[PDB]
Nucleic acid binder design. Structure first.
Ligand SMILES: [Mg+2]
Ligand SMILES: [Mg+2]
Ligand SMILES: [Mg+2]
Ligand SMILES: [Mg+2]
Ligand SMILES: [Mg+2]
Ligand SMILES: [Mg+2]
Ligand SMILES: [Mg+2]
Ligand SMILES: [Mg+2]
Ligand SMILES: [Mg+2]
Ligand SMILES: [Mg+2]
Ligand SMILES: [Mg+2]
Ligand SMILES: [Mg+2]
Ligand SMILES: [Mg+2]
Ligand SMILES: [Mg+2]
Ligand SMILES: [Mg+2]
Ligand SMILES: [Mg+2]
Ligand SMILES: [Mg+2]
Ligand SMILES: [Mg+2]
Ligand SMILES: [Mg+2]
Ligand SMILES: [Mg+2]
Ligand SMILES: [Mg+2]
Ligand SMILES: [Mg+2]
Ligand SMILES: [Mg+2]
Ligand SMILES: [Mg+2]
Ligand SMILES: [Mg+2]
Ligand SMILES: [Mg+2]
Ligand SMILES: [Mg+2]
Ligand SMILES: [Mg+2]
Ligand SMILES: [Mg+2]
Ligand SMILES: [Mg+2]
Ligand SMILES: [Mg+2]
Ligand SMILES: [Mg+2]
Ligand SMILES: [Mg+2]
Ligand SMILES: [Mg+2]
Ligand SMILES: [Mg+2]
Ligand SMILES: [Mg+2]
Ligand SMILES: [Mg+2]
Ligand SMILES: [Mg+2]
Ligand SMILES: [Mg+2]
Ligand SMILES: [Mg+2]
Ligand SMILES: [Mg+2]
Ligand SMILES: [Zn+2]
Lengths: 114, 151, 100, 126, 97, 81, 60
RNA sequence: UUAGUUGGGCACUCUAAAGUGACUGCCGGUGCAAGCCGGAGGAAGGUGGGGAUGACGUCAAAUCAUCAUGCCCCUUAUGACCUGGGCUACACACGUGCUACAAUGGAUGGUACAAAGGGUCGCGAAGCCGCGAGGUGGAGCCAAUCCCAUAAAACCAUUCUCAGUUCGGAUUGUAGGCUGCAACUCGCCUACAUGAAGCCGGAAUCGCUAGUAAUCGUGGAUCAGCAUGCCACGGUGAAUACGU
RNA sequence: GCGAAGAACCUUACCAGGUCUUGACAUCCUUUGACCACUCUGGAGACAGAGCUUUCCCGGGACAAAGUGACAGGUGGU
């Protein structure tokens, strides 16, 4: 419908944020710039409204190629042979925080006991 | 505690409705010292009760409370056996304590929408011996009457 | 399962010492139907006159085992400390069973 | 035009009674605006309720310190003392109702080694 | 037209000289306003008691400073030089305007 | 300097790299300045960086510019538990 | 290495950000009050003897 | 008057010096006395509330690393200087805390009420710039005068509709700000995006008797910068104690 | 969430490399007596090579150097 399917019963300011690259604030910007009010259900949208929305959205980065762009950034910094690249290989906290305790949303669940 | 009985703290009667138990109910729905939230969610309840039913809110509250306050209650202790659930008569004061505790411990779990309603249709259910708190009192009475020999 | 925190003051913790402590303390599991998960704590000190002191603490569910012993040899102190601990076990078990 | 001074917690109110209608004014503001909530209004009226003198005086008050509840108690004490000031006869009714005693309850000191005034840190026995 | 500020670590020593100033002023015919006790300033120092361990045991010391204030509105040179050549015990601080 | 005042490089290393501008290019630059950022002028050269106990070699490629030298010279030795 | 540390500390360092503070009676680096330039031990033992003006035990 | 501002007054709060005041003192009962219970007057009644205060001694308890000292040891090094790293590692285990698991809530806009503190190699306002962290500027101030600093919960409106979501915020990519000669190992903060576990937590276990527990903020020491830690301050503010 | 009322360098006491030897720190003898600073070159820096002065202050003192010696120096141990 707008690059990817969106919920029907939710307001468009809350529905547009289902795209990989649109959040609470840039959706507000798109809605304000186009002209639609942020309290209209998406099932009540006219065809001209969505038509106007689509190219405004497609001008800025879209859910599709952002994946590959960020992935190639990670690949660049991991093929160079830097500290962040070694962390990305090994799967450890890239930002400089401790790892004696609490590196769990990276290392995974608490593994089998030694 | 160990030296002797200790005097209670008298509860100043609330405004608007001018009762005692209403303030002790407001003090029970309190969380983290937030007096205003409990006050609002109780006054809204006693107003919608009149809007829905057509009677004085305090009459519905009283005739729903009179069905929840238990009389007998099982206490695990010595005398008549080492913790054999001897049934005992709750004192006059302990009644309203248990009544409000059961009224609020179950009005938190009814589960439709905002609690500003969940407390009202529990008073309506208690006004005619139905719900969950009344079930709690009946269950406690059954268990108390089960041990009719250990007294 | 038992978890041992072994500390050695004025001495270095050597693997045979660890194994001896592990087995001697593990012989304590026979007093329960269910093996607990409490943290056993052991401390080892040696003085200048060849005298050794060993302190053991075990926080059971509803019991606290503490035992310290000094003797001419470290291993003898370990054996006597085990005897002390089983003594507390029997005392507590008899008391709680009597208070049935 | 008769003075009175009330204190509670960390709040001080200077109350003065004038014969008149009964309009209530707090710090150049109306009694329904400064303290909006309905039930935080009957506290001031109790000294004027324990005796039937509801519409016999207008109050002029100047208050500072504490939160909205504490200065309500302060202004209550102040208006009661002012009522005794106008008439040296109303003492039995109010002293009987316990409406003259100042609240000796104050926030309590903190203590080193404790997380609050009496709360102690957690400890373990397992 | 002159304002005098007196501050010291002890009120007992302070107030003697504080008054000594007002008598030595008004004896030579000066219109003077009496001392006005300004708020004291007290500060707290908490230090661990032990040498190595035991953070839970501490000791607290305090240092509190007292202040006064004197005004003269219509002085004469005799009051000026009388106050100026008068000498106060060490332990007070006088800041003549 | 992570502001807009400008980049940061120690003069005792900038001097060496810009004096190594000749076609010889056979002067491996030994350094202790791990904190110096990599300039586009570094492209081509080869720099040994001290990592605590030895000078490890780094070959300054195109996409390595902008970072800090100490990134490519790890200071901890980890193999596994 | 103690008596050399005081001598280094009183010298002028290469850059300002390398300066630091030690107690003056004893050479203790940690927990030194800049009001007195004393540590937490040369303060306790020496305020008891009444050698710091103004400072007394607090009981409030 | 832009309004305690301006002239004017210390009447009321307020600051702080000296006093009064509470001592079972009086009354009724009891006992024979110490004392016990009840009542009166009073702001306060039974050491009013809270601090400081820690007997002889026990654990050869802790500190030769705050300091001092006996004996031993090294003295072209076990003494001294410089740069870079390390104390910040990571298959795991234990202790103390912070934030959540939502509707007594989330989000948006309006608006009111504090106590205690710090400031001259220092605090740093108005004004303009920037969505924001912040930049430019320089007013006043050696401070009951000026600044940090229009407290947040609370209250009134609108919206969301019981979902792993308009809950939660981890983790990560990009672009910036401040301090510092320097921010990769290794700082704090901001903007866009990403969006994890988590739906009240087994056996067990801790804290608290009234302005306490709970909850919400504020200040300070260390400090160029860095606290969910430590020490203090107030706002709202409960339940229960039959009994050993 | 203990010494630590606050580890990027310093703190720092640990490791790698480069360095010194009456010495980084004090009493003490000889003499020059202000050495000190500061500018440039070389080095990661400690440090070397030059240049400018040294008006020491009033025989005494403050500090320094040069070799000079008895000596210091240890966050080494219990
Ligand atoms: Mg999503
Ligand atoms: Mg976003
Ligand atoms: Mg960190
Ligand atoms: Mg942990
Ligand atoms: Mg020891
Ligand atoms: Mg044996
Ligand atoms: Mg205490
Ligand atoms: Mg305690
Ligand atoms: Mg602690
Ligand atoms: Mg203390
Ligand atoms: Mg020493
Ligand atoms: Mg230095
Ligand atoms: Mg520093
Ligand atoms: Mg320090
Ligand atoms: Mg004024
Ligand atoms: Mg008598
Ligand atoms: Mg009485
Ligand atoms: Mg007392
Ligand atoms: Mg005493
Ligand atoms: Mg011990
Ligand atoms: Mg020694
Ligand atoms: Mg050699
Ligand atoms: Mg550490
Ligand atoms: Mg959210
Ligand atoms: Mg708001
Ligand atoms: Mg103030
Ligand atoms: Mg400040
Ligand atoms: Mg500060
Ligand atoms: Mg200025
Ligand atoms: Mg501030
Ligand atoms: Mg709803
Ligand atoms: Mg970084
Ligand atoms: Mg789940
Ligand atoms: Mg749910
Ligand atoms: Mg108690
Ligand atoms: Mg009591
Ligand atoms: Mg700071
Ligand atoms: Mg170093
Ligand atoms: Mg030279
Ligand atoms: Mg020269
Ligand atoms: Mg010696
Ligand atoms: Zn010291």
């Amino acid at each position: 419908i707008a690059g990817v399917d969106v919920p029907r019963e939710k307001r468009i300011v809350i529905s547009l944020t289902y795209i990989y690259g649109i959040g609470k604030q840039t959706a507000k910007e798109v809605l304000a710039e186009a002209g639609v009010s942020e309290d209209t259900r998406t099932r009540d949208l006219t065809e001209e409204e969505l038509g106007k929305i689509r190219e405004i959205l497609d001008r800025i980065k879209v859910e599709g190629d952002l994946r590959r762009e960020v992935n190639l950034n990670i690949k660049r910094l991991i093929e160079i042979g830097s500290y962040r690249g070694m962390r990305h290989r090994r799967g450890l906290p890239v930002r400089g925080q401790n790892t004696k305790n609490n590196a769990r949303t990276r290392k995974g669940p608490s593994k089998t006991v030694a | 505690p160990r030296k002797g009985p200790v005097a209670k703290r008298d509860v100043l009667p609330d405004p608007i409705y001018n009762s005692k138990l209403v303030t002790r109910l407001i003090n029970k729905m309190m969380v983290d010292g937030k007096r205003g939230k409990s006050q609002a969610i109780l006054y809204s309840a006693f107003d919608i009760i009149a809007q829905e039913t057509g009677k004085d809110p305090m009459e519905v509250f009283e005739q729903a409370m009179k069905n929840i306050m238990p009389l007998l209650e099982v206490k695990a202790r010595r005398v008549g056996g080492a913790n054999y659930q001897v049934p005992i008569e709750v004192r006059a004061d302990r009644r309203s304590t248990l009544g409000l505790r059961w009224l609020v411990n179950y009005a938190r779990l009814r589960g439709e929408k905002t609690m500003e309603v969940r407390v009202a249709r529990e008073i309506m259910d208690a006004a005619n011996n139905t719900g969950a708190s009344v079930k709690k009192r009946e269950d406690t009475h059954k268990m108390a009457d089960a041990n009719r020999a250990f007294a | 399962m038992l978890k041992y925190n072994i500390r050695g003051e004025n001495i270095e913790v050597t693997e045979p010492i660890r194994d001896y402590v592990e087995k001697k303390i593990d012989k304590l599991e026979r007093y329960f139907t269910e093996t607990p998960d409490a943290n056993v704590h052991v401390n080892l000190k040696v003085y200048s006159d060849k005298n050794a002191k060993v302190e053991v603490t075990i926080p059971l569910p509803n019991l606290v085992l503490r035992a310290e012993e000094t003797s001419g040899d470290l291993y003898a102190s370990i054996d006597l400390i085990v005897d002390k601990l089983e003594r507390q076990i029997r005392k507590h078990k008899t008391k709680v069973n009597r208070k049935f | 035009q008769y003075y009175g001074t009330g204190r509670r917690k960390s709040s001080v109110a200077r109350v003065r009674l004038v014969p008149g209608d009964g309009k209530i004014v707090i710090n150049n503001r109306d009694w329904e605006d400064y303290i909006p909530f309905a039930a935080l209004r009957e506290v001031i009226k109790q000294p004027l309720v324990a005796t039937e003198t509801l519409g016999n005086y207008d109050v002029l008050v100047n208050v500072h310190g504490g939160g909205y509840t504490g200065q309500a108690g302060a202004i209550r004490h102040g208006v009661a003392r002012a009522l005794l000031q106008v008439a040296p006869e109303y003492r039995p009714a109010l002293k009987s109702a316990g409406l003259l005693t100042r609240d000796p309850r104050m926030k309590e000191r903190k203590k080193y080694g404790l997380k609050g005034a009496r709360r102690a840190p957690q400890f373990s026995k397992r | 037209k002159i304002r005098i500020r007196l501050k010291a670590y002890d009120h007992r020593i302070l107030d003697q000289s504080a008054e000594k100033i007002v008598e030595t002023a008004k004896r030579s015919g000066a219109s003077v306003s009496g001392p006005i006790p300004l708020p004291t300033e007290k500060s707290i120092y908490t230090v661990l008691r032990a040498v190595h361990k035991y953070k839970d045991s501490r000791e607290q010391f305090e240092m509190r400073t007292h202040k006064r204030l004197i005004d003269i509105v219509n002085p004469t040179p005799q009051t000026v030089d009388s106050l100026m050549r008068l000498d106060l015990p060490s332990g007070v601080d006088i800041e003549i305007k | 300097r992570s502001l807009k005042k400008g980049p940061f490089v120690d003069d005792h290393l900038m001097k060496k790299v810009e004096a190594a501008a000749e076609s010889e290019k056979k002067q491996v630059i030994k350094t202790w300045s791990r904190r110096s950022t990599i300039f586009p002028t570094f492209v081509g050269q080869t720099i040994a960086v001290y990592d605590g106990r030895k000078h490890v070699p780094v070959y300054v490629q195109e996409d390595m510019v902008g970072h800090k030298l100490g990134e490519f010279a790890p200071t901890r030795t980890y193999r596994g538990h | 290495a103690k008596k050399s540390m005081i001598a280094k500390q009183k010298r002028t360092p290469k850059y300002a950000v390398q300066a630091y503070t030690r107690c003056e009676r004893c050479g203790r680096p940690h927990s030194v009050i800049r009001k007195f330039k004393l540590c937490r031990i040369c303060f306790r033992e020496l305020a008891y003897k009444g050698q710091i003006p103004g400072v007394k035990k607090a009981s409030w």
